[PDB]
Write a protein that binds this ligand. Structure first.
Ligand SMILES: NC(=O)C1=CN([C@@H]2O[C@H](COP(=O)(O)OP(=O)(O)OC[C@H]3O[C@@H](n4cnc5c(N)ncnc54)[C@H](OP(=O)(O)O)[C@@H]3O)[C@@H](O)[C@H]2O)C=CC1
Ligand SMILES: NC(=O)C1=CN([C@@H]2O[C@H](COP(=O)(O)OP(=O)(O)OC[C@H]3O[C@@H](n4cnc5c(N)ncnc54)[C@H](OP(=O)(O)O)[C@@H]3O)[C@@H](O)[C@H]2O)C=CC1
Lengths: 399, 407
């Protein structure tokens, strides 16, 4: 049992992933790792009870202890309010955490040699660098229930000329929203993508729709171009790599037609959508890592890219067995452990974390998998039996 | 030559598509069809000169004559202002036309039997119903060059409680934007998708990110669900089909692992992105139709889903040969002519439009194709011997159409 000097922030979640998480912690991590966990229940009942304070606390603890492992959580809508008897529609915990921590979320597939791809052309993996700040996740939206003028107004701190924009004169009912991003957050996002692309010796592509959002998306295009020209142009030339900005509509088709082997800088929203296309295309949502790398180059939050997988939980609620892939949730733990071991200089912790990752891949390659992966092969084991095979193979590998 | 009583609005465009468009009109349409064409040059130099009035005018003309055929156009940014030396960064002509006309843009692949898919699982076609109004296309965005507060003001016209929301307090430089949609536009978009799904006898899926944009995306989900329960539940139930709302992140993955055969209602932005994933996955951006179906159920605007193909035009400008797929552009004319034929009752125009569509598919199926398609068969890196260049391919279309008209 490996002794761990510093703690790891643990963010418990919801539904099917909460079930998988409990097994990982109690049967895969804690039996072989003497680790202190700063436990934060990000389960929807606890978030409602604490009036979403538990979310902010888990993020501040992450900034403090440098490492977080997050279970998928429910982002409530009108239907969840009825289902859980909530006080209100709480903001996305992911949105709250990412806005507090900041940075770039790096997402990439967990490759298994035996799993056929839905996109055979993708011979090499692709990494998405998703901007973790602002945009839709920090937007203010409303229902306009009558006629009225929708205006935007920017009042500078320096008391210069007040700017005013008439967005829309509503003739009747509708919807409106406002959102923002900062030069400093875009800069940190840009630096992280150029640094990762150099490290991988891979070209970097950044996508926007600047032809439409000329000022909003144009700033992303401008900031990335400026930073490349000043700090990374020479390094990119030395490593025989390149940087290119493409329109999102073009980029997505370019990706699908490609053979992989590149870094893709995505805006916040595109990052979510496109990483799920990548994860599915390579094999499954259960086969993708997701790591938030903060601008300080020390703090991380590892998670799965998928959700609480509600549809599989509904079957469980009926007493029926399920076939939910836990590998991504396992990799949230291992990636959080690898980083803990890297900071502490604990070679034993890194070695265990690398070994649990390897057992996951080996188990799939040995023909033991969940329905999502069996479907890739022919068009399988239940959740608990696949997890038991992981536990068996990890104990067998520990000797 | 087929006589046509009523006119069709023709919106000319830019770069590679403008060259292709000239051949289509002069060598494929006009030699066989006596039609009045309400011409509008939406070519970037002309838009600048007329201060973008030509765009507004073309859209008003489409409302009058019920049919428009549009060539892909450049939406200018800073780099285009430098290149063309423009008066300003003019708004998207598509955004402008789409917001005046309104409706849903229906996008689907043009299927060729011998073209291998990049997504082999897609054994049946998929139609995207793209909301053509509001959102990022009617957005107001800005660069905040200094610290300051960004707030939204909603002033009700009835004189009731004026509302305020502070979006952000900028500590330094940044970006801000505001956007909207209407209940009327969402309702019309909903009705169009449900009706098309019944017509196809296909289930309908609508995607949003309502968990994040609880009010904005929530309105789409609510309006679609309201309209389904009230007007289409029985019609869907009798036709063995269903309607389902999905989160966009789940939807895109569900689509990629599907075998096709459904209608996908997309919000404005997603509609563009996902249409290009669909087009590429089925074979090419050159093999997809795009038709704007207005709320009046009479007015349409047919186009290609792709852009002006700037990269291919940059090679053309160097004097080098290009291999650009004109089929999507040909289908924009055929769909416009097909609809003109339908409204007027002109069966000979309908049959010509259908014949020219048949020629396109048969030409590719005969092994005569552009680089994009040949690359599906032989690989984009290992190719010159397996594809025809642009004009050469177009000459093959011309020859095969002549041969088809012969019999
Ligand atoms: N970072 C986070 O915490 C995220 C949370 N969410 C939340 O999750 C909830 C459910 O959202 P939903 O849209 O269903 O998204 P999910 O990603 O939870 O599930 C969507 C579908 O993807 C497949 N899938 C996802 N994960 C796995 C897995 N581990 N193994 C096998 N298959 C998987 C399943 O497909 P099939 O049904 O075909 O088997 C599943 O029904 C919502 O409340 C949402 O707010 C959503 C995204 C991210
Ligand atoms: N509705 C409209 O009018 C639209 C206009 N635009 C405008 O088009 C311009 C260029 O935009 P861009 O981002 O390059 O998008 P395009 O769709 O014009 O081109 C992107 C790439 O897709 C492939 N492609 C697209 N169409 C064809 C075709 N007909 N035949 C063969 N290959 C094709 C080519 O790939 P490869 O390079 O690999 O051969 C091409 O370089 C911009 O000015 C933009 O504003 C963009 C979208 C829509």
């Amino acid at each position: 049992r490996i002794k761990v000097a510093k703690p790891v922030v643990e963010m418990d979640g919801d539904e099917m992933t909460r079930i998988i998480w409990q097994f990982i912690k109690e049967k895969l991590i804690l039996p072989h790792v003497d680790i202190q966990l700063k436990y934060f229940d990000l389960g929807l009942p606890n978030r409602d009870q604490t009036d979403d304070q538990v979310t902010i606390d888990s993020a501040l603890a992450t900034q403090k202890y440098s490492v977080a492992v997050k279970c998928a959580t429910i982002t409530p809508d009108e239907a969840r309010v009825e289902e859980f008897k909530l006080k209100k529609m709480w903001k996305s915990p992911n949105g709250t955490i990412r806005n507090i921590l900041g940075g770039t979320v790096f997402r990439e597939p967990i490759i298994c040699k035996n799993i056929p791809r839905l996109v055979p052309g993708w011979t090499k993996p692709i990494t998405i660098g998703k901007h973790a700040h602002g945009d839709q996740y920090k937007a203010t939206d409303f229902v306009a229930d009558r006629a009225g003028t929708f205006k935007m107004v920017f009042t500078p701190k320096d008391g210069s000329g007040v700017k005013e924009w008439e967005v829309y004169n509503f003739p009747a009912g509708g919807v409106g929203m406002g959102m923002y991003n900062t030069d400093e957050s875009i800069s940190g996002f840009a630096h992280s993508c150029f640094q990762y692309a150099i490290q991988k010796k891979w070209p970097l592509y950044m996508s926007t729709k600047n032809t439409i959002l000329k000022a909003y998306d144009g700033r992303f295009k401008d900031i990335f171009q400026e930073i490349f020209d000043k700090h990374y142009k020479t390094d990119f030339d030395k490593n025989k790599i390149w940087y290119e900005h493409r329109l999102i509509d073009d980029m997505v088709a370019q990706v699908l037609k490609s053979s992989g082997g590149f870094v893709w800088a995505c805006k916040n929203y595109d990052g979510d959508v496109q990483s799920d296309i990548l994860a599915q295309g390579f094999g499954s949502l259960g086969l993708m890592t997701s790591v938030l790398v903060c601008p300080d180059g020390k703090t991380i939050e590892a998670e799965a890219a998928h959700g609480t997988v509600t549809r599989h939980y509904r079957e469980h609620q009926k007493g029926r067995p399920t076939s939910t892939n836990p590998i991504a949730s396992i990799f949230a733990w291992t990636r959080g452990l690898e980083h803990r071991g890297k900071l502490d200089g604990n070679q034993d912790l890194i070695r265990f974390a690398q070994m649990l990752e390897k057992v996951c891949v080996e188990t799939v390659e040995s023909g033991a998998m969940t329905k999502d992966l069996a479907g890739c092969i022919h068009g399988f084991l239940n959740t608990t039996d696949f997890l038991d095979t992981i536990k068996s193979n990890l104990d067998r590998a520990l000797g």
